[PDB]
């Protein structure tokens, strides 16, 4: 569980909020909003309206950035988004972590979220609980403009200026929530504190 960002719950705030998760359209199997919505249990309209997308049915581009609505809850001082998912042929907790859910979750947390189920083999159409990293804003963050801490998987050769510009987030606010140089969080989930849902650049 190497990730230089603490997803621990808030002491100041409520323990159950509504926030967003940053998803990237993926190469073979995740180029439509309907396909991405199938693993988050919601309509592709909500994803389109959150990602600031005009055409809901418009095919997506690899590494196109989306925003997925999510309900963040606190479980054992740690906060996750409990998401139900039906097992398909060839699925396992590990592969789901690094492909379908693109490193917005751990195999370890995925496993601990389903302690009585098996990670490697599991029958078809059996439902599992995918835990996605998220966090509710501290009351000190709620005092200022901050209303969402958006979960974002730090990509390779990303930087603070680039990320904060896409989301319209304050860098100092961003680094206060993470407190690291982002030198060891590649393909790991970090937090973008925004004041409002950003208008993304879309084709
Ligand atoms: C989530 O984060 C994980 C890191 O924890 C990240 O894992 C990476 O996945 C890719 C793809 O599965 C791995 O890339 C492979 O690297 C090996 C050597 O390390 C290569 O041999 C592979 O080469 C090719 O193999 C095929 C031919 O046999 C080709 O047809 C194919 O196109 C491959 O290019 C391949 O490059 C990478 O090693 C891991 N890295 C780690 C540290 O595990 C994963 O990509 C992240 N997921 C997302 C969605 O971002
Ligand atoms: C959304 O996701 C689904 C599944 O995750 C994707 O379905 C896949 O679609 C391709 C073609 O688009 C299928 O390939 C086909 O294989 C059959 C043989 O089974 C062949 O006869 C066809 O000519 C074609 O090559 C693939 O099987 C299918 N996968 C599954 C599991 O059904 C779909 O493409 C995704 N769509 C988007 C927009 O991302
Ligand atoms: C994640 O959510 C699922 C439901 O969406 C939880 O499972 C349910 O738990 C209640 C509590 O008694 C049961 O009545 C339901 O039958 C369960 N549904 C199932 C198992 O599909 C699950 O407990 C949640 N996980 C965590 C870690 O909070
Ligand atoms: C983060 O994930 C990316 C894949 O999205 C990894 O990039 C791949 O790395 C392997 C090994 O060098 C190459 O064979 C692939 O061609 C790379 N994919 C590209 C360039 O699109 C990257 O290595 C991962 N980084 C970490 C730290 O895990
Ligand atoms: C969590 O906060 C503490 C306080 O310094 C420290 O362990 C670290 O900065 C954070 N954790 C990680 C994995 O960065
Ligand atoms: C973004 O930051 C990385 C280092 O984290 C750097 O290598 C890259 O050149 C930067 N890109 C831009 C456009 O400044």
UniProtKB/Swiss-Prot annotation:
Disruption phenotype: Nod(-) phenotype characterized by absence of response to Nod factors (e.g. no rapid calcium flux, no calcium spiking, absence of early nodulin gene expression, and no root hair deformation). In the nfp-1 mutant, there is impaired nodulation response to S.meliloti, with no root hair curling or infection thread formation and no Nod factor-induced root hair deformation. There are smaller nodules with an aberrant infection zone that contains more cell layers with smaller cells in the central tissue.
Membrane-side (Extracellular) residue stretches: 1-203
Tissue expression as described in the entry: Mostly expressed in roots and nodules and, to a lower extent, in stems. Localized at the cell periphery in a narrow zone of about two cell layers (e.g. L1/L2 zone) at the nodule apex upon infection by rhizobia, from the meristem to the infection zone (at protein level).
Modifications the protein undergoes after translation, according to the UniProt entry: Highly N-glycosylated.
Residues of this chain annotated as glycosylated in UniProt: 6, 35, 77, 82, 103, 159, 181, 187
This protein's domain notes: LysM domains are involved in Nod factors perception, especially in chitooligosaccharide-binding.
Function: During nodulation, plays a central role in nodule organogenesis. Involved in the perception of Nod factors, the first step of recognition of rhizobia prior to nodulation. Necessary in epidermal cells to induce cortical cell divisions leading to nodule primordia formation. Required during root nodule symbiosis with Sinorhizobium meliloti by triggering infection threads and release of bacteria into the cytoplasm of cells in the infection zone of developing nodules, especially in cells derived from the meristem. Promotes plant fitness (e.g. fruit weight and leaf number). Involved in resistance to oomycetes (e.g. Aphanomyces euteiches) and to fungi (e.g. Colletotrichum trifolii).
Name the record gives this protein: Serine/threonine receptor-like kinase NFP
Species this chain originates from: Medicago truncatula
GN (gene name): NFP
Residue numbers of the full-length protein present here: 31 to 233 of 595
